[PDB]
Subunit: 240 residues, 4 copies
């Protein structure tokens, strides 16, 4: 993954969990990583230290990407700082509460779909021209990676229907983006985490077991001929 | 399909296309069909005449189901007329325009997702109580049938990404509803049309032509009948001339 | 399903279970049904009586379709009797024993694949020219229906790996046949039965709940624009 | 991928194409690679020289793995040389001809299914005991990686039906092996190439060209490394320039 050195990678929802672990793993190969959350972390400089300690660089950008204006602002701020985008990682998302169908109102639907649907759509939209520029300059490809879910495939847990559907939504919109943007040499791939006795490996995954898949999809040398794919990382929980 | 006689079937978006053809075919087996559109058909009496001539009955209910309040109102109106719901057919939906990703704004996203996402969610939400009651009274099952799409599987055409995604959204939410509502003896199935009535799309179809609405309706009849499909739930039947073989 | 009247339907493995139930249901719409098993049933005339009582007709043909020569003989015998084939139903198949991977030898592999693979391949092969002729004469379509399985999708039970794989094999070869033979107006579809607490409906299916799907796929009026599809009949056991 | 140093990786069909490229890329991380072909390469010393120049080691083993006896013999030979197996890569396979269905005879069926079905079954069968022992000794996982195909998903080209089916067979038997062998800390994953090195096939690929073997190898390296993919089993990674997006 020597081709990740100096690559400018914007990761949404990356101050904790999978996003932060991915940021660090990418930074180990010299990536320049834009961290993001809707809230300021306790110690932003510490996160930056971990990126630089690993061998890369970066910055933290606060932005609430449930709002389209904020997606625009985040992309513009990242490009102002680093002069472009080589990889976008759509990682921000989540359940945003649980509700059986009969208790779902407009507010609940809006909340879940803004977090998991509108955010990914608009982040990607605003990143496209920068990703297009990146691939043109490098003569290789640029990349989008999005965090999917097992729930996209088998409906998710009771009360998590809208969330599950939003991930199926994501998995399929990537297929559309392959059709539109492969001509621009932009690749699109998904890492789909699982959720214990329904898991063949008999345990939940750790963030360290998720990060390498993102690194793989980020590197043109590793995955340059790979686009429109979903790699499920779930200890065998589903074998699609 | 003799077990469809008297069954009360609410079909959203059924004044034209697949919905109207399905309504007529169900009426042939004596179904009582609720026709619906967001706008008034120019003569509802004629459409209802066709249902009765086929051998069934029904009524027309105007409701713009992109609005949650309208979904509640439509279910209430149908239940006011027929006291209950035995089958809900979520057929309303559509592209609502095309846009390359870089031209998509909030309005475009909201429009497509209200038409294909919010609508089916809220229609199903408001119908489920009645479907539950229906199944309990009959001792068999009640049914939800939703119109999906090939685009749920392979991303749809350029400009149709949000539509495509909204259909994948539907296909997967049905899987969730199987988990929640199979205990209430409610079945959930999808008919996923390919291309229904250009040369390039036809060449991508092994049968070399687009489908007709008459070729779509029988799949809905099959999924509506407990006798035919009583042990079938959580499934998608693609009707597409071989355009995709999933 | 009024267009099934007089349709000549050859069903392999149809003296018991799904095959016999399907034969009867088709006969209710006036179909002429060729029954088949590798062994003579106790009372062949009784089965014929059930077809005729339902409203159709038929005959019983004994043939061991694990052997290609027997597939040829069965097709030739059916056509000798009824002058053609309008629908082929590949229903013969089954586990043929259970074996964990380490105990699988050539004999086991051969047994399972002859029953589930070679049989379907060769039955369909020998039927094609008759199915081609049927569709040309009717001006509509002729049809192949094959019995698949949930096991094609999720690997089957422990010890049933070769069986499970043979069903995935079937599901995919149908996709190839769509490409080759749609130009001949021959349709190909699959009914995929499930196998209790892993089943949302909380029970196993009955043969009566399986038969209608076959009738649906057999009728041009019902499924004339449907080819290359799999309808899983499994009480929600998998929602693919 | 530092955890690949010294790992003993048996790759069937690895004197050319994807197998040879994968062998070399693994050797770069210090792997000990068993090269195999059903026929003798014209100079094995040269191929082994490339493995050592890359930074690894290995040996060549001739075996026609369409025969079960040869599968046993190959595993025995590799284990005789290196005492065990840490990763098995089932890469041997291929069309073995094309035939329209009406021209397929028993010989055609047997040939394709021995090459793509029987071979992978028996190679995996004979390797599993050693993979089990390997995982126990290391305290991590051992791995099986098998070469699948786009044809497993969408039926393959005209004439390639049995090949296509044999790859679907493989994709699904891996799912069974996850159920049986995850308890032994053996992982099972598939790399499914699309088209690897005509104008019509290229136009069906969004990237507008066939893949190269160098673009396939990294996926195998990823699946071979417990550090990279230790929580990944029962998966298929398609490497196809967008030809199918499953």
């Amino acid at each position: 993954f020597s081709d990740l050195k100096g690559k400018r990678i914007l990761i949404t929802g990356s101050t904790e969990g999978i996003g932060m672990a991915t940021a660090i793993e990418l930074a180990r190969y010299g990536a320049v990583v834009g961290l993001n959350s809707h809230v300021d972390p306790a110690d932003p400089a510490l996160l930056l230290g971990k990126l630089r300690e690993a061998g890369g660089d970066g910055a933290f950008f606060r932005a609430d990407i449930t709002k389209t204006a904020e997606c625009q602002r985040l992309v513009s701020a990242f490009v102002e700082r680093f002069d472009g985008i080589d990889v976008l990682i759509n990682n921000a998302g989540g359940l945003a509460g649980r509700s059986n169908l009969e208790n779902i109102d407009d507010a609940f639907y809006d909340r879940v779909m803004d977090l998991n649907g509108r955010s990914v759509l608009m982040m990607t939209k605003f990143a496209i021209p920068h990703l297009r520029a990146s691939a043109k300059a490098s003569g290789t490809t640029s990349a989008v990676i999005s965090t999917g879910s097992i729930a996209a495939r088998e409906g998710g847990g009771i009360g998590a229907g809208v969330y599950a559907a939003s991930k199926a939504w994501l998995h399929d919109i990537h297929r559309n983006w392959v059709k539109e943007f492969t001509k621009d040499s932009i690749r699109f791939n998904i890492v789909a985490p699982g959720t214990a006795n329904s898991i063949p490996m008999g345990r939940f995954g750790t963030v360290q077991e998720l990060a390498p898949a993102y690194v793989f999809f980020a590197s043109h040398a590793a995955s340059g001929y790979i686009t429109g794919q979903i790699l499920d990382v779930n200890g065998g929980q589903i074998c699609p």
